Each structure stands twice: as structure tokens, then as C-alpha cells.
Motif scaffolding. Structure first.
Motif, short mmCIF file in Angstrom:
data_model
loop_
_atom_site.label_atom_id
_atom_site.label_comp_id
_atom_site.label_asym_id
_atom_site.label_seq_id
_atom_site.Cartn_x
_atom_site.Cartn_y
_atom_site.Cartn_z
N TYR A 94 0.84 -1.19 0.00
CA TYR A 94 0.00 0.00 0.00
C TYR A 94 0.88 1.25 0.00
N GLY A 95 0.82 2.01 -1.09
CA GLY A 95 1.55 3.26 -1.17
C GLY A 95 3.04 3.06 -0.98
N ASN A 96 3.65 3.90 -0.14
CA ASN A 96 5.06 3.78 0.18
C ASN A 96 5.32 2.87 1.37
N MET A 97 4.27 2.31 1.97
CA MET A 97 4.36 1.27 2.99
C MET A 97 4.99 1.75 4.29
N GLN A 98 4.96 3.05 4.57
CA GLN A 98 5.55 3.64 5.77
C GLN A 98 4.46 4.14 6.70
N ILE A 99 4.61 3.89 8.00
CA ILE A 99 3.64 4.37 8.98
C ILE A 99 4.35 5.05 10.14
N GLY A 100 5.65 4.85 10.27
CA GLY A 100 6.37 5.47 11.37
C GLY A 100 6.00 4.85 12.71
N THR A 101 5.85 5.70 13.73
CA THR A 101 5.65 5.21 15.09
C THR A 101 4.20 5.28 15.56
N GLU A 102 3.41 6.23 15.05
CA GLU A 102 2.07 6.50 15.57
C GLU A 102 1.04 5.78 14.73
N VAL A 103 0.37 4.79 15.33
CA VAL A 103 -0.57 3.94 14.60
C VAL A 103 -1.90 4.62 14.32
N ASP A 104 -2.21 5.72 14.99
CA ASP A 104 -3.46 6.43 14.74
C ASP A 104 -3.25 7.78 14.06
N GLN B 254 -1.93 4.38 -7.83
CA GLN B 254 -2.00 3.34 -6.81
C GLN B 254 -3.39 3.26 -6.20
N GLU B 255 -4.06 4.40 -6.03
CA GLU B 255 -5.39 4.39 -5.44
C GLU B 255 -6.41 3.72 -6.37
N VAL B 256 -6.40 4.06 -7.67
CA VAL B 256 -7.35 3.41 -8.58
C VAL B 256 -7.11 1.91 -8.62
N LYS B 257 -5.84 1.50 -8.64
CA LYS B 257 -5.55 0.08 -8.73
C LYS B 257 -5.92 -0.66 -7.45
N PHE B 258 -5.83 0.01 -6.30
CA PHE B 258 -6.22 -0.62 -5.05
C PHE B 258 -7.72 -0.89 -5.01
N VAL B 259 -8.53 0.13 -5.33
CA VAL B 259 -9.98 -0.04 -5.29
C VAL B 259 -10.47 -0.91 -6.44
N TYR B 260 -9.77 -0.90 -7.58
CA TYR B 260 -10.13 -1.82 -8.65
C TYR B 260 -9.93 -3.26 -8.21
N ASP B 261 -8.77 -3.56 -7.62
CA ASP B 261 -8.54 -4.90 -7.08
C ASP B 261 -9.61 -5.27 -6.08
N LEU B 262 -9.95 -4.35 -5.18
CA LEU B 262 -11.04 -4.58 -4.23
C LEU B 262 -12.32 -4.96 -4.96
N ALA B 263 -12.64 -4.24 -6.04
CA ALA B 263 -13.85 -4.51 -6.80
C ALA B 263 -13.85 -5.91 -7.38
N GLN B 264 -12.68 -6.40 -7.78
CA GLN B 264 -12.56 -7.72 -8.40
C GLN B 264 -12.28 -8.83 -7.39
N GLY B 265 -12.19 -8.50 -6.10
CA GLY B 265 -11.83 -9.48 -5.10
C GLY B 265 -10.41 -9.98 -5.20
N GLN B 266 -9.51 -9.17 -5.76
CA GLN B 266 -8.16 -9.61 -6.09
C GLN B 266 -7.10 -9.03 -5.15
N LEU B 267 -7.51 -8.32 -4.10
CA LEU B 267 -6.57 -7.87 -3.09
C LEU B 267 -6.12 -9.06 -2.23
N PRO B 268 -4.99 -8.94 -1.54
CA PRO B 268 -4.50 -10.03 -0.68
C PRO B 268 -5.27 -10.14 0.64
#
Ligand SMILES: *C(=O)[C@@H]([C@@H]1N=C(C(=O)O)[C@@H](S[C@@H]2CN[C@H](C(=O)N(C)C)C2)[C@@H]1C)[C@@H](C)O
Length: 237
Positions: free
Chosen positions: A113-123, A137-151
Motif C-alpha cells: 500500500y503506497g510507500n508502505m511507511q507508517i512510522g511510530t504513531e498507529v493512529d 496506486q489508489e485506482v488500482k487498489f480499489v479496482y482490485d477490491l472490486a474484483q476481489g483480487q486484493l490479498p
């Protein structure tokens, strides 16, 4: 479509994806390869990670604690789906805290997801960085969601898809998620989702544009639906 975009002072890009073809529209096409904080659009990935890792259900009620929240509209109880359409940050911060920083970091890297960085603060990571993501990346993420193809488990993806169901128009179904990142400079506007058309074809999209405080909240969705009508993806009823 192009006359519509520069009818505003709009620095904007609108991306579509059909599963083979990325199409770019708007006044600033380089925005599509530029990375921005996801803001409230991260609630899609937050719900997926939370449901996959058994930290919450789609029927659980996150009850208000009595303390006034950022918007008065958020001072009530929410399911994850209700909080999804209300963009109720406190409910999804409570979820991210259930997930925890190490699992959240590992899961975002697992799904790329994106650059895969979250640092220290989870919220806080999706609201002021370091997590960033491009509109492509955003269109491809929600497209995969639409097709059930996300991990993710298929029923997990189906549950989050239902959380994004915002309009039925004949036999066409719109799924969408808005985002406004105000704790960054410049401010960023998101409108991402997909249309399940009557003919069976899915078309994912992402609006991404510069915001400032005076802007109307409804502008992102209006723009997106206007463009989708022009494109023939989602004609006005
Ligand atoms: C997420 O990006 C931020 C939230 N996104 C918002 C937005 O896209 O509108 C708002 S929600 C605001 C109060 N609820 C209203 C609403 O969506 N409806 C009434 C349908 C608008 C918020 C800035 C979040 C990180 O703060």
C-alpha cells in the motif's frame, strides 16, 4: 470534460482504470504519479486489515464515549460501514489501535500500500504522513477490491465493498470514498471508488486535487460524478 476542469481554479487529475488501461483527465496530469497522504481514503485499507486480522466485525457498534469530536456529526455510535461513509476518524483510530503498529506496518507492506511507511504513531500515519500513495496506486487498489483480487479473504473484501456502496442508479452501482487531508500543506482532496455498470464492466476512478479551507465539501463528489457522466461510465439518472 476538459472545459469542466478549468472552469475552476482546479489543480486536478481524474484517473480511470478498467483492468488494462489507465486513463488521465484534468488540469494537472502529473498529479497521478505524485504521492499524497491518503487521509480518509485509508479507511478502506484500515477496514480490510482490521477485518482480516479479526480485530473487528462489520456488525459491531463503536459507541460514542461522550467526548465531543472534531465534527458534531461524529458524536454518535457507528458501525465500520456507517463510520466509512461519515468518515468518522475516531472510530478508525480506535480500530488502528486494536491492530497495533507492528501488525499495521507488516500488513501495509504485505499488500504493498503506497510507500508502505507508517512510522511510530498507529493512529496518525495516514493523516500527516509518512504514509503516501499516488492516485494511480489508489485506482488500482480499489479496482482490485472490486474484483476481489486484493490479498485479503474474499468475504473481507466483500464486506468492505458493501461499506463503500453509495448509490444505485438503475442496474449501475457506485462505490466511493472521499478524503480531505487538512493537516498537510498543501491540502489534498480525494474521491476514489468504482462503478459496477449494468453491462457487467467495472470502472475504477480516483479524483485527486488541491484543496483550501473555503472549498465546498460536495465539490469533489460533484466533479467526479460530472466527469463520470461525461465519460459514459455513470450517466445521471
Ligand atoms: C478524511 O479525509 C477526513 C474527512 N473527510 C471528509 C470528507 O470527505 O467530507 C470529512 S467528513 C465531514 C463530516 N461528515 C460529513 C460527510 O461526509 N457527510 C455528511 C456525508 C463531512 C472529514 C474532513 C477526516 C480525516 O477528517
Amino acid at each position: 470534460v476538459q472545459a469542466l476542469f478549468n472552469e475552476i481554479s482546479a489543480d486536478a487529475v481524474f484517473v480511470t482504470y478498467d483492468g488494462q488501461n489507465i486513463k488521465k483527465y484534468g488540469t494537472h496530469l502529473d498529479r497521478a504519479k505524485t504521492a499524497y497522504i491518503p487521509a480518509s481514503t485509508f479507511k478502506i485499507a484500515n477496514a480490510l486489515i482490521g477485518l482480516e486480522n479479526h480485530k473487528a466485525t462489520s456488525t459491531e457498534i463503536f459507541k460514542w464515549d461522550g467526548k465531543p469530536r472534531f465534527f458534531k456529526a461524529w458524536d454518535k455510535d457507528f458501525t465500520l460501514g456507517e463510520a466509512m461513509q461519515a468518515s468518522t476518524v475516531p472510530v478508525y483510530q480506535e480500530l488502528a489501535r486494536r491492530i497495533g503498529p507492528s501488525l499495521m506496518q507488516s500488513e501495509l507492506q504485505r499488500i504493498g500500500y503506497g510507500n508502505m511507511q507508517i512510522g511510530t504513531e498507529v493512529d496518525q500515519f495516514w493523516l500527516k504522513g509518512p504514509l503516501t500513495i499516488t492516485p494511480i496506486q489508489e485506482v488500482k487498489f480499489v479496482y482490485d477490491l472490486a474484483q476481489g483480487q486484493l490479498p485479503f479473504k474474499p468475504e473481507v473484501q466483500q464486506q468492505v465493498k458493501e461499506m463503500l456502496y453509495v448509490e444505485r442508479r438503475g442496474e449501475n452501482r457506485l462505490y466511493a470514498k472521499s478524503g480531505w487531508g487538512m493537516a498537510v500543506d498543501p491540502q489534498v482532496g480525494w474521491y476514489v471508488g468504482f462503478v459496477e455498470k449494468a453491462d457487467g464492466q467495472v470502472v475504477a476512478f480516483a479524483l485527486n486535487m488541491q484543496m483550501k479551507a473555503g472549498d465546498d465539501i460536495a465539490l469533489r463528489k460533484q466533479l467526479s460524478l460530472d466527469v463520470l457522466d461525461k465519460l459514459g461510465v455513470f450517466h445521471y439518472l
